[PDB]
Amino acid sequence: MSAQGDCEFLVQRARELVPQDLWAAKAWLITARSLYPADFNIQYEMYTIERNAERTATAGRLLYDMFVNFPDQPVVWREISIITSALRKQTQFLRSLFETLPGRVQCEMLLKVTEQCFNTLERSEMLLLLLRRFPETVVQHGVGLGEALLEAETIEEQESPVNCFRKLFVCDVLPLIINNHDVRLPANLLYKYLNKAAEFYINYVTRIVDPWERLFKILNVVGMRCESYGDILHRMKDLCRYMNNFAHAKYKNQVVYSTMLVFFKNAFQYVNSIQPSLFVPLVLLEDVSNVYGRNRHIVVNKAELANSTEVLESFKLARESWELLYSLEFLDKEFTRICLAWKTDTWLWLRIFLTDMIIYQGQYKKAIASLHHLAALQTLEHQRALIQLATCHFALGEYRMTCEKVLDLMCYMVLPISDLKLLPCTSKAIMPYCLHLMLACFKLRAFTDNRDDMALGHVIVLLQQEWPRGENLFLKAVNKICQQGNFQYENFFNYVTNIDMLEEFAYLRTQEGGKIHLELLPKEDFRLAMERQVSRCGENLMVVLHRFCINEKILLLQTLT
């Protein structure tokens, strides 16, 4: 008689006693175990009874017996897998069972499970419990799985650096290796690790508990290992004054990595400030103020932005960080290397900030090129490049392209109502900008000691806005008309809905104003139009100005003046 049949009979007899008498079933299984100590079925069944009875003390000792004697049973691995899943009422019961076993056995079992895994995803999380549960295993495996995570993300070729692999690395794998002092790592490993961490951080902030704070802490830890956001900029500047003046690999690594980190932080703060959606958009423009006449200050109204001081300071700090970073040849070359290593398109907000920098820098040609780049990468809300390219054209004495861009700007304007200003994208602020710009361009065009009269008529039409701030301008215009005479404008009586203008132009017809032959229509009819035009007084001046501008796209032909 084979012993297997006796074991089955003993198990079957004990199984039948389970619903009636657990103690009798346990007594049967105790005798069965004594007869056949090497039988797995007897031990597993009474192990199952303890698990069903939820007796951790007995069951916990039993799992060790099965593990150290019968590790090849698939049921043991299946049950162990359920326990690991619970680790990642029954869940608490299984968790308490895990704590009964000694730590030496627990770590040995976990390492065995790590080899059994097939997918790298489930494998990484399976072992991740062991490192936190057993911090002493960091030196043995912390670096290895970090590189394994590095290649696992690499072999999948994700379009974005945001994935399970990177998130596991930066949030969990990154802190544990750097914090441990026993685990010593080379400087190059530190550089690649911090590069990946910074990439994950910027991806997260642009698109978790504290991305920027974690990145700053990681940067500080890296700086300490190799040995506010404002004072550190000055401290690196002092180090430049102490090290950049004369391999100095540590100095170069610091002066590039810390600088780019603080630059990225300041740039993201500034971008979240202006146009927060891509992080009531704001647009750093150049509004000519005296249209009726390297350390510049950005003038911004506090009503549209109550945090102007801090964001201005952030922009300033990013400014010297960029200036210092591109200055040193070595530091600039390493920045170019790291930026080309990243996605060279550099998303959207980096381009926006670089455009703003170029606008403030003074090189408006590069500003126009970057505006073209941004437009290709893309008032409503998106047409910031419209006003930006308009002011860029206006800076470099274009006087044709700027008018073209301004006219195209109000093509998308629908609303019934120098120094670097800062205005929102709402009509109430952009419309005065366009009107001032066009008034300036046509004022320069007309006042040229030439025979042009269309330019003078146009500077008359645009002098209405913000009456009577153009008082001296209109005085000069009427004096010029009196000196010249024979003023001609076919569209005059379709745009001048102002009463001082009309009153003066009627006085120009009488003797004391001189018999100035005014050709303002396209003798009694000359008075007749005024009998009708005055009835248009009180209308929305913005509306009539906008209608005049959109209707007469031949302004560009007149801009030749």
Binding site: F9, L10, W23, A24, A27, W28, I30, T31, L35
Partner: protein, 360 residues
């Protein structure tokens, strides 16, 4: 020596008993100081017989109790307790057993720990004929005379565990389940079940505390009552079937299964104790001579019970006996070869578990 006896003749019975108790205490203390092993001469025994109504007996028991509580030295108290209640082979024994039983009962009532310890050490060093009588008297007056009095016996578990173990051994030796009149009461078995379940070591303390220097005399109380519990679980279905209340029978069967599990656990830890004490394979707490009578009792109960109608009880008893024997052999409690096991149970009724245990 006669001066003490002459002095006590002028006092009343209670006063003479107290004075002779004090004199015996002083004499035994002096003897123990002079020599490590005192000798109990006939003088103190005669004085106790001569000097030591219901009210007078109650006052005498109370004086014994408070005197025993007053004494702090264990050896003198044990020696005096023995001299008071050791067998003497005279006609005055029945009075001495009666006094011992009354004193034990009243000490249990008022929790006299020194008296309980003295009684526990007494039960180990006398023949079982008086231990079974004391056990029967305690079971009676704590279960059948006054209902609800067995709770007072339950608190002794936390007070005098040695006394509880001695009482368990005595009741196991007394109640062999050989007759319906020997069927143990429900309250006593319930209390024993709770006592053993609360502490498996309650019956193993007696094996550990005393130094094992010689084999116990034949006819005395066993060191560990595991033999009695094994006999109880083996003969429980047979005696109950012979007696044949369904709920009471079910509760009794459940309690017997619980105590069988407790006995298995006790043997399992006794294996480790024997390994620690280096007595594994050398000292056997379960004598082979005590298993033949219970095997014959099981066989005669099987023959008398007409197994054609009571097959379940016979099978369960055989399975319990096989399990107990296998656990004892594995745990080293029983030191015998498998040939003796095969020969002894060859006449026993056929059982699959028993045959597997025999074959191993």
């Amino acid at each position: 020596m006669s001066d003490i006896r002459h002095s006590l003749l002028r006092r009343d019975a209670l006063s003479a008993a107290k004075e002779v108790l004090y004199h015996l205490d002083i004499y035994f203390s002096s003897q123990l100081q002079s020599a490590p092993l005192p000798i109990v001469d006939k003088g103190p025994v005669e004085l106790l017989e001569e000097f030591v109504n219901s009210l007078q007996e109650l006052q005498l028991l109370e004086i014994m109790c408070n005197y025993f509580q007053e004494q702090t030295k264990d050896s003198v108290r044990q020696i005096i307790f023995s001299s008071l209640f050791s067998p003497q082979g005279n006609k005055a024994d029945d009075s001495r057993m009666s006094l011992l039983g009354k004193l034990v009962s009243m000490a249990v009532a008022v929790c006299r720990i020194p008296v309980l310890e003295c009684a526990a050490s007494w039960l180990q060093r006398t023949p079982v004929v008086y231990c079974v009588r004391l056990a029967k008297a305690l079971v009676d007056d704590y279960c059948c005379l006054v209902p609800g009095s067995i709770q007072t016996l339950k608190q002794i578990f936390s007070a005098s565990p040695r006394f509880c173990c001695q009482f368990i051994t005595s009741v196991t030796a007394l109640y062999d389940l050989s007759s319906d009149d020997l069927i143990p009461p429900m309250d006593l078995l319930e209390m024993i079940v709770t006592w053993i379940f609360e502490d498996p070591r309650l019956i193993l303390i007696t094996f550990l505390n005393t130094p094992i220097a010689a084999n116990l005399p034949i006819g005395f109380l066993e060191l560990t009552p595991l033999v009695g519990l094994i006999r109880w679980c083996v003969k429980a279905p047979l005696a109950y079937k012979r007696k044949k209340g369904v709920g009471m029978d079910r509760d009794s069967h459940l309690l017997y299964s619980k105590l069988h599990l407790s006995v298995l656990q006790v043997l399992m830890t006794l294996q480790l104790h024997l390994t620690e004490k280096n007595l594994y394979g050398r000292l056997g707490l379960i004598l082979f001579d005590h298993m033949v009578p219970l095997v014959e009792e099981i066989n005669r109960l099987a023959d008398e019970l007409n197994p054609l109608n009571a097959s379940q009880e016979i099978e369960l008893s055989l399975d319990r006996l096989a399990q107990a024997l296998q656990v004892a052999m594995a745990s080293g409690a029983l030191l015998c070869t498998r040939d003796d096991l095969r020969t002894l149970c060859s006449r026993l009724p056929h059982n699959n578990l028993l045959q597997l245990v025999i074959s191993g």
